[PDB]
């Protein structure tokens, strides 16, 4: 009449299985077996499966063979009981009852049953709640559960077929998603951005839920399921009521699961893992409980970063106001929709690695399609000659060889010993010609300058200003896998959508941020005052270098050093519309073509041309000004820049006619006063650590976001976006 287990408050054990002809029911038995505080089975029923001469040995062995060919844990009899015989419990759906009930032995719980259940499926709802239900929410209850719960038919299961279900918190006795959603690592896999381990908790999870470091199974099953639900339907807010029905496990443990799913769900949304992207919501639809709502924030700048954080905080239930200096939202996302049936970005338009990219998520949510680039990119000389495939392969080989040795040279150098990448390449190159008396033609040298300029484009600067040590610092961290895409409708759709329904003040350049008093005083250049409890700055790096905002108290010297160790990198775009697709014969449907430079100084002058209609019907070309060439273009007017582009094209297509363009634009980001750059890079002397230091909040009061604050993913719209999500999460925590 007492439990085997030490310190069980089972003052009256009953047998849940009643499978043996001799069940003790609620009587005396040689030994009561304990599965939980409220769950026990009798020695006779124990024997009914455990011993070979009884009727339940057939069952026990079939299950046991499966649990081994599909599992990694011990197939103990207590495990068979918890997986196969323990009754289910389901909570009444009637708003005013909400009581938990035991279903009878033979009923198999399904989501449909959980969705709709009501007591008695007399006033059935008025019968008292089995007292064992309250018992489940005592901290010690879980400590006295023998085995950890394993979920049945988890939505996560199809995505986890490479793991043992029990290691990911699922039952071994079990068994059309967007190709870019790959939220779980596979076992023995290369690093990729925004992937979680399904079988290990990550640092913020261990921090938030310390109680699961002893045993992470319950958390992992619930976290994995939640993610898989989010990714199966990313167009709706994912809520506890949509989760509960998909939690299928026997016994009172299921009651502990649905109580935890809430806490986990709110953690996941705060951190921006689910219920994010372009999901709009409100008012009585806020994603985080009343508990986070009472607070206010001012966000400065309405580009991807500021809009990300604004969207998140607003969805959370928090009061947000955004102050934008310009007469438009978007920042360095600025789309031209005036070309015939083609959208051309003056700023951002490529998505670099789509797998697990939030931009690919948002394209889902919006039903937008992206054009994946082809690999081909011929290197056309002036005037006409496509570069020999062998010559192209030789110079590519050497160029990357030079990068290898730069990488070998840097391993023992400190910041105080940094040299510019440009210098360290030329040297190694000159050292190499000397060493081995090979001679390159004028052409092979020009092909080298193409690659060199292509690095200049990536960095947004001449190679003589960029750190050899730290130019590719971010590749320390896992990077976005998969396709590079043309975002054909433009990033402006995502922007417009994130901004929809938020409080945005345009033409309100901020000048003063005072964080001395009880709350933050923000003052525009015309003297308009705003105040809030928190402030988030997302202005571009170059504006922080020019000190365009007065900070009171001043930013630390440690911050200024980081701010100044990064470059405000720059590129300019030219776009040209033509009467017809003059390049088709020669280019043959390739997405872009290269322009081999005639000389080192001219290398950043339209190095690559992008065909802007992936449907290959309209005729729009885009090209880029990088490196030295940005300097040489600052005094020239738009028409003069055009002329050089046209002269370049007529050299590239020397043996044919090229039409006159019928419309164009030339970008002047460099002299946009609230922007003054294209993207950040590490100047010589710097470290990637500078991104983290800029990212550090001040006094849990002043926060920073933007591409120049994201160490993992600098430069990009994506990087900017994720920095806004990071800060919204930190702001909501407080």
């Amino acid at each position: 009449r007492k439990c085997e287990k030490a310190g069980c408050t089972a003052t009256c054990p009953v047998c849940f299985a009643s499978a043996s002809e001799r069940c003790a029911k609620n009587g005396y038995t040689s030994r009561w077996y304990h599965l939980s505080c409220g769950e026990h089975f009798c020695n006779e029923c124990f024997d009914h499966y455990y011993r070979s001469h009884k009727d339940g040995y057939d069952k026990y062995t079939t299950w046991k063979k499966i649990w081994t060919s599909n599992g990694k844990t011990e197939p103990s009899p207590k495990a068979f009981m918890a997986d196969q015989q323990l009754p289910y419990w389901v909570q009444c759906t009637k708003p005013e009852c909400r009581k938990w009930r035991q279903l009878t032995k033979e009923i198999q719980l399904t989501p449909q049953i959980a969705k709709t259940y009501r007591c008695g499926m007399s006033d059935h709802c008025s019968l008292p709640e089995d007292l064992r239900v309250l018992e489940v929410s005592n901290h010690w209850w879980y400590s006295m559960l023998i085995l950890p719960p394993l979920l049945k038919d988890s939505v996560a299961a199809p995505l986890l077929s490479a793991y043992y279900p029990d290691c990911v918190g699922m039952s071994p006795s079990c068994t059309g998603m967007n190709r870019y959603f790959q939220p779980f690592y596979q076992p023995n896999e290369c690093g990729k951005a925004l992937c979680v381990r399904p079988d290990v908790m990550e640092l913020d999870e261990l921090y938030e839920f310390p109680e699961y470091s002893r045993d992470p199974t319950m958390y992992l099953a619930l976290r994995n399921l939640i993610l898989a639900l989010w990714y199966t339907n990313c167009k709706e807010a994912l809520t506890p009521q949509k989760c509960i029905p998909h939690i299928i496990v026997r016994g009172l443990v299921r009651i502990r699961c649905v109580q935890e799913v809430e806490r986990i769900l709110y953690f996941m949304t705060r951190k921006g893992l689910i219920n994010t992207g372009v999901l709009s919501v409100g008012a009585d639809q806020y994603l985080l409980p009343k508990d986070y709502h009472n607070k206010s924030v001012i966000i400065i700048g309405a580009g991807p970063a500021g809009l990300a954080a604004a969207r998140q905080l607003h969805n959370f239930g928090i009061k947000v106001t955004v102050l934008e200096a310009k007469d438009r939202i978007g920042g360095r996302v600025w789309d031209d929709k005036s070309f015939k049936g083609v959208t051309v970005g003056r700023g951002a338009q490529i998505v670099n690695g789509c797998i697990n990219n939030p931009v690919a998520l948002m394209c889902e949510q919006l039903g937008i399609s992206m054009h994946k680039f082809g690999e081909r990119c011929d290197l056309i000389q002036e005037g006409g000659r496509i570069t020999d495939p062998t010559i192209d392969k030789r110079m590519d080989f050497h160029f990357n060889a030079l990068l290898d040795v730069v990488s070998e040279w840097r391993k023992d150098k400190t910041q105080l010993q940094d040299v510019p990448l440009g210098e360290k390449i030329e040297e190694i190159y000159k050292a190499f010609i000397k060493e081995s008396g090979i001679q390159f033609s004028e052409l092979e040298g020009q092909v080298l300058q193409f690659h060199l300029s292509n690095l200049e484009y990536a960095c947004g600067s001449n190679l003589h200003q960029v750190s050899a040590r730290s130019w590719d610092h971010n590749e320390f961290f896992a990077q976005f896998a998969g396709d590079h895409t043309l975002l054909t409708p433009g990033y402006s759709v995502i922007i417009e959508k994130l901004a929809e329904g938020l409080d945005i003040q345009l033409k309100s350049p901020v000048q003063c941020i005072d964080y001395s008093g009880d709350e933050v005083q923000v003052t525009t250049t015309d003297g308009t005052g705003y105040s809030a409890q928190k402030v988030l700055v997302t202005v571009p790096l170059a504006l922080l270098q020019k000190g365009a905002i007065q900070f009171n108290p001043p930013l630390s010297e440690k911050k200024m050093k980081a701010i100044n160790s990064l470059g405000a990198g720059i590129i300019e775009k030219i776009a040209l519309q033509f009467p017809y697709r003059f390049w088709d014969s020669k280019v043959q449907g390739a997405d872009f073509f290269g322009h081999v430079p005639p000389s080192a100084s001219k290398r950043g002058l339209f190095a690559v041309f992008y065909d802007m209609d992936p449907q290959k019907k309209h005729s729009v070309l885009m090209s880029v000004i990088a490196g030295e060439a940005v300097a040489s273009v600052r005094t020239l007017d738009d028409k003069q820049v055009l002329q050089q582009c046209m002269a370049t094209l007529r050299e590239l297509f020397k043996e044919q006619e090229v039409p006159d363009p019928t419309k164009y634009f030339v970008t002047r980001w460099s002299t946009d006063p609230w922007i003054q750059m294209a993207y950040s890079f590490v100047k010589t002397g710097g470290s990637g650590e500078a991104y983290d230091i800029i990212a550090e909040d001040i006094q849990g009061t002043v926060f920073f976001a933007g591409e120049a604050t994201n160490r993992h993913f600098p430069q990009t719209v994506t990087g900017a976006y994720l920095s806004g999500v990071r800060e919204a999460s930190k702001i909501a925590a407080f």
Binding site: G191, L194, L203, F476, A478, L722, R726, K730
Partner: peptide, 12 residues
């Protein structure tokens, strides 16, 4: 190993 960590769940 910091290389693998999910960006949003590594803000300790």
């Amino acid at each position: 190993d910091p290389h693998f960590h999910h960006f949003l769940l590594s803000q300790t």
